[model samples]
Target chain A: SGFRKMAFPSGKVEGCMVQVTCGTTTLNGLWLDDVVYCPRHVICTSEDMLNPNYEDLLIRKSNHNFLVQAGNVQLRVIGHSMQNCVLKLKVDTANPKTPKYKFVRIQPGQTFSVLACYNGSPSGVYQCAMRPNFTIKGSFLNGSCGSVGFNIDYDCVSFCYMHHMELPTGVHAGTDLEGNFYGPFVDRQTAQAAGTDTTITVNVLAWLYAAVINGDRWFLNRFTTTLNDFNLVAMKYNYEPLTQDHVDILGPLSAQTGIAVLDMCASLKELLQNGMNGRTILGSALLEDEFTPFDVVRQCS
Target chain B: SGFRKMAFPSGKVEGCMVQVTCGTTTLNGLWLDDVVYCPRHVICTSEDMLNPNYEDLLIRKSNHNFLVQAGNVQLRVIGHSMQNCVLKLKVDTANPKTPKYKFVRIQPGQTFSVLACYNGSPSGVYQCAMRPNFTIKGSFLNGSCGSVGFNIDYDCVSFCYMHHMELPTGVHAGTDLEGNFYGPFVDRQTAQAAGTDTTITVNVLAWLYAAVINGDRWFLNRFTTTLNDFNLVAMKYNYEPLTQDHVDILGPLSAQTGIAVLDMCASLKELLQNGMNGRTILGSALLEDEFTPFDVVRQCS
Candidate 1:
């Protein structure tokens, strides 16, 4: 029970031990028949044991090194050294070209944690390294952490894919660049975020398609049959139906002239199915195509 | 055919005709009775008649001004003037503090379109104005097109809400700031994005609750009864189950300690439902309270 009082850098005494020998002299104070009892630090090297140049030698002799631990979304760095040390953490992101690197000055007994990855976004790998630093500038403190590296595998649950669209300038609300317009919907934020006079658009069109697949009958009747028309319109504009990637970024341009949001969803499905075989309407010619029955308002004489 | 040959500045003569009168003197050269059959630019004004200063009078007499037309997502600015004009378009975004404005120079007859809104992102309103810039240096040529504005309602379909968490630095791939480690799933981008060293933390605990509700007798027997312990653990460390907004941004922290993705989806459901009423877990105490028979690796010695 008294052996537990010995300090092992890992804060554990369960599997730790120390030994000391000096040429012809074998240490006798803490040893009982070749076993060193409750030994905190010991030197086995033949040279002057406590020499200042051997500070790093103490750690080497004790087998104390930088220890790293992992979790579902983070990593912990545990420093095991007789003196303060500088640890560098390198975090990898989804893009291999850009790896994030961070450094920390940890005391001999300190432990640090860092974030690795998260769900609903991107995920990546990570690694870390450490070296000894004695605030004093001398040959005794210039030891490298060597090539020791601690690495971990960071994972996630789901990733969000983003879709974007560029609408022509001066477009009105509730409509596409064409003369079509969809009426009001319950999701105000969704609707507003979906419309703006820029290329940064939303993917509300995909949800509508999802709704149609789930069998929203009213939307089915109005939009389900117009796949051919929508494809023709896209063709007229030199655009095709949705591709796999395109479907992920789809919008409610289908309901451009329609009144209900479901119509937009229905159009999303048709366009998705049309894919490569869709028609091509060159240039801004699509602007002249009026998909809705509503008459264009003459605001100026 | 003869009537169609004339151009009345608005780029059409089909619905345009002009009559001129010099006070009591009726201009008769190009007129048959009161109608000028093929009038090109007939002026009844007394001030040097066609002088550059009378630019505003031409628009007033012809009833031609700034025209605004809307397509599904764009507005077209149609300038119907006898001379080149300067048009300014203003675009707005969800952020009221910053609005986008642009100016364009249009010839006597021209049309330009501007973007309005789209879904899956932020959207906003827009307006436009016009002014006249006479080429002549004299004051007479400097006239104002004044008070002309075009406006449009820019809308969208849906908005996405994001939830975030911050883990300690350098933990690992699968575990979070706490020593608890959630395991694998097929989706990489989503899982990693879900867990990391920062604010976008996982909702795996909720999924365990979900597993309990779904009666996955195995997960229930293993993780269910530990809910109280987990909450108490979080309480010690100042963390609780997600808030209402938190659930909305919650991700599938399902790849927790187990191998099944379906289990994670199930957990996602439960955690989503648990939302606001969830409890807290304190410190990295959960590591000391291992629910599964998984061994905590002792890496540092």
Candidate 2:
């Protein structure tokens, strides 16, 4: 109602005051407050409150941040300010000697608190594997996302306990004069914004874990066994995630040679480049099969 | 003793004719009669006839086909025809449907015999692994090596049970439009004589083993485990073999990244190219440590 009609002479109104709340929102008006009602909402005595439910009618009352009161019961509306989830994060995998990670969350204006997430594993022998796509150049936007973003659980156990052997120049990994490593393993945000292409030589890691109990430990290994891992589309312009759908397209075979890993990347890249709608990029090594959560034993020590 | 060298002219002259035998070889000559002595051996009252041992002196006998009598063991010797070992072989790894192998040996002109050697394993679950250094480009020189050439045991079990996933294109191994497998695993002789260079890709195998009991099959694998294997120095010249010394130089680490496998070949090539001595190449995946003959279980079925 516009200013065309005054507040119905305030005290002279012939209706009882009322208040109604749906979910967490509350509003007030008069029980039969049709003459003096909210602009965004109205109070009616049609028993059905203007033919639509109070919740629906109130929702229809529009304002970017303002709430509305409606229906026969929502005579008196009283409310307070509300809030949403907030996030702060810091992710670092650059320094193995000192891996750094920070995750924080604050909802409804609550004090921001840190979340427990260590980038590496507790087992000295097996550290949490950095995402294969993550590289040295990427960063978690100063480790702070304006939005409350989370990359799920901070990794603990890993089926892929990988490491680098050496560069083509015969320099040991992480010890090269140039100081390159198997990772700086950042999240996708950092990976997508990578300034350079990802190379297989740099991140084409070798699974360091052997079958300790298997005699073939002399020549047996994890990747050679399952033959599956993130390919990172090595030598690609930027990181594109792999998804279960792609895995589905890859069919039942759970094997990939060093080169096949490369092929997966190429295929995923092609699907994305072609703008295929069904194509999806999945999370990193962190994603486990729902069927077997402990398929790869996570030994902390 | 020239015209007199004629069989002692029916032996009418000489105190006695004599013959000597040494190390399976025998020769004949005259004794004290000296008048009709053999040119190769002379009978002498001399205690140590001719001072030099008969064995050595006879070895120096002038006639290419003639045996010489130079000693005084009555200088009488009896000998028989001797023979050497003979070899016949047939190695077939090309056909999984029909694996035919033939190996035969005959010694002392004896009857030829065949030895048992199957290229695959009996287990429908796991097959005997073919050697990593082997490839389709090589053959066992028609599977024959005259004069008893043997490639040790025709493998019954293997530490590696690798198979190709496909070529660079998306095709199943051994079922490729062009048809290729992880093997046709040949011996070093065939590898060295490869018609072309060995490629890391064609042989850049994925160790097809996973922690069957481990939860990480989704990404964990075998090469991801032990990391050791015969690297044909893919994409390089003909195979030059890898040696324990290389493994020694490789140190206590029993790991080799897929690419590192290539580096090993390049290093050995460099040592050979520089004409350096004492650089030895090693055998393939078949070579097991003497300390543990069953380091990798040999499961037949």
Candidate 3:
């Protein structure tokens, strides 16, 4: 104690060390040598360490790469050298030929990725087209989203299915002639975008549909009954994508006009335009209530 | 014969003698004392008589009135009047408020008076507008065909009711602004001409009707249900007049939409331009199954 300064200098001769006090009521005396120290993650915090072209988690903006490390996990490095760019993407999948997505060209260096998700129900590829000016155009898969980088994210809600009618201008959708109509049908995104602004002339075999099932019958008599299909397809409540697909497989017109299909499609358009226009009070050529998930009116352009 | 020849020899110097040959049946020989043979009817043959107004009919540049004698019916002789015109019209009694009629303006002096032979059903005051030229416009009452120099001549059959919507823009069936939809309807004139090239949009409110107690349940269900007053109101049908009075009842939307009810009355301009779009599909919040009659598409301006 008299020679404290000299004693302290001799005790501190060891390099870069600190002394600490602890409470006695610890678990098994901290298990001294048995304690395992977490390893140095060697996170690629240095922009030089991360390859610029690696198609994985990305570092943003500046060219310098950096990583944020926590619990042995490191987020990719962001660098000063990162440009104000975007990641263009194309989300692909395998399923029916519906819900197609066009390729998305994002702004250069933008940290977004394309995601392809499935709802356990099979689906097809969906693409988004991004304008060079950072605007997005073209068709995209329903329920799919892209990240800032090249990550893939696909969403398939159990309730959503693609519902569309071909445009009359003799062209498929997503072209100069026809706009994309396929959608995460019954979803807010698609529902919000539709309107009756344009016109359509359908040669509806409406009467034939009614005649096929011998006019009106009230209950669900078969798995492929109009009521069942309507309840399954039109109403948002009984949304079972796989089940609908299965039914469609059972009968080609299951989603087709089993009973007054033309009228039903018109009804769907009306619902899309003005929200749910008496879809609940619906009845087919066969008896069935009309229920739909789309909001009664489209609020946006 | 010898005696007659002998008398002819004596009369050879005289003028020709008239000989009367009677049929094999009874002949009452009468003295020719003061006998006078008068020709009661004179069949005058003139090239112009058969073709009274060929020039006007060909150019469709008909004058006001022309005489027409079809069978026992003889139209009074009038000079260049619309009364000489004959029109074939059909009605769409689908919507009561705004019935529609389809008619071809018949040239005056045509032997055919668009046969109102359907008796009571074909009887009503129908207004006609010029074919977008605004050249001539007028109306004629059916049962009161005497005004147009005609009379109802057949059994009437109006098995169907007419449906009326608000108005038309070119050929569209309905109108919508903001969130509110106008109708699935037609003017009375458009409805009457259901089978030809024109068509009327009607609200097939099966469910709303079915929703009422013992309401019209012609579509899906059997056990019968309840319907309300609005359903009944929508079920009303009548003939459409292409006049300002009918257009005046357009909507509470008058002050808001800016297009006045009277604007529809200005000319067939709105009718020829918009047609039934505003009354049927576009403006209707409720969807319907409709088959069109007449040339409902746009004629090139």
Candidate 4:
């Protein structure tokens, strides 16, 4: 097996230029795919031991610490320092920047429906996508990336909350006879004063809420505790409601979506002006223009 | 055109003994459903002119005020005072109490899935049922009562947040081979540290959040501005994380359901203890035991 017959002056055998820290220098055993090779973590290299894969930067800080960018394959061992010393590598596929947008709610063992943007090439998909305020979906594995994962760059990924809210009963969500689009929301006051049914108003608000939050996780991140659920008791005690500046951020989004959003958005904004201490819902007594009957608006994606 | 001809001593015709005022002084028109009866509002009458249809209480405070309990009928007209008075009764079928349970997100022209508790009864369905903290679905119309309404007492209804949060991708829901129940939520710390997918934790939190909130709109009424969406900036500005007392309320629910909820609930509660202001989600850093791999619990009804 003595092909190259070359050994470092330090008496250590180098399998590949990438892994030169070992002894038992086998000059000919240098080219076997598994000798000092990462059979699957993506096209690695034999040239630079510091940064084996040019695309990936595997950093081994200590004798026991080995970090490898998880690629199409497993088995993270970069290379052994000595012959017969098996160096097992730990796979760390964390995205450089965590994705923040719409989290999808998908089940395991199925081909994901919302990941049209990420088709599984190990890149930096987890890096924050610069488009905030613009509606987008982020793949949040929740807790099942490798188990229920679709290939995403840096890490295998999944989803959390998708903005697919179901409409309330008696609300139509489609194109009208004139081919005009409509969603579940209509004018708030129309149902009651019009002498039809007034209950749909509340349902519409639910839809509206889901749309805003699911449209972007920022809503979840900002309005509610990220790690915990939203607590009314907290808001009431704190007297914390959305401010004008915060409310203004929603305007750009409303301006773009044409189907319908201003009325509901206005209702939400106006109510927040009172601060978040609205502990009790007096129903109609607490609201005025929120009941105006409007048309349905498309939900935020 | 009269049957049992009779005239009142006061010089007025009495129709159905319920509406006796100035008229052509004929009594034979006694039982025509419309002579003094409600043509459509279901089983109305003319027995006691002061209180017609004993089943309903039509009270007239002023000669101009007619209040009739809304029934299975539409035209809310009690009776005329004078011959050509044309008394128009206002139909008011508001339930004595507003429903506060799970809001259903149904569409227009649908029979509704969760109204098994209510079936178009013209009763005090709106009156608050003696069920709080009980797992139930309240038909909140979200303001679309008439147009997209279901027959709820004080008002027709629809839904808002239904606790129907979708599971994150790659996460398995439903019973495994063990015939155990599971519905989307697993553990918190189990996803990543277990050497598997880690994003599932975030998605699982989304599901867990939806479950707690939609279980009862109380979550919405209290935590958020009733008429507005949730505002994270407010929480951050006010430093308002949920208190331990508030967090304990979720205990009863967790104890009742056996599928899987404790782990996630603990995660939520523990984080909220920092107050309503755990502003930045350093994620895994902000959390401790949230990654425990658990099972899914059935969502609140």
For model 2, report DockQ.
Answer: 0.00
lDDT-based ranking, best first?
4, 1, 2, 3
How much DockQ does model 3 earn?
A: 0.00
Candidate 2: how large is its RMSD?
Answer: 36.9
TM-score of the second chain, cand. 2: 0.17
Chain B TM per candidate, please? 0.18, 0.17, 0.18, 0.21
lDDT of 1 by residue, A131-248 (tens): 1110110000001101111111121111110001111221112111111122221111122222211110122243333323322323243444344555455444334343333333
For candidate 3, what is the DockQ-based docking class?
incorrect
Candidate 4 structure quality by residue, lDDT tens digits, B1-301:
0000010011011101122222221111111233231111112233333223422332323323332322233324444332111122222222222333222432111121111111121100110110111111122221111111121221222322111111222112111111122232321213311112222222223334433333311111112121111123224333223334323544444555431233543444335444324232322123221211111121121
> How large is the C-alpha RMSD of every model relative to the true structure?
34.5, 36.9, 39.0, 29.2
What ranges in model 3 sit over 4 Å off? A1-207, A214-301, B1-252, B255-257, B265-301
Give Cα distance to truth, residue A23, candidate 1, Å.
52
TM-score of 4: 0.20
**CAPRI tier of model 1:** incorrect
True contacts kept of 4: 0.00
Give the Cα lDDT of each candidate.
Answer: 0.21, 0.20, 0.20, 0.23
Best by lDDT: 4
List the candidate numbers ranked by TM-score, top first: 4, 3, 2, 1
CAPRI accuracy category, model 4: incorrect
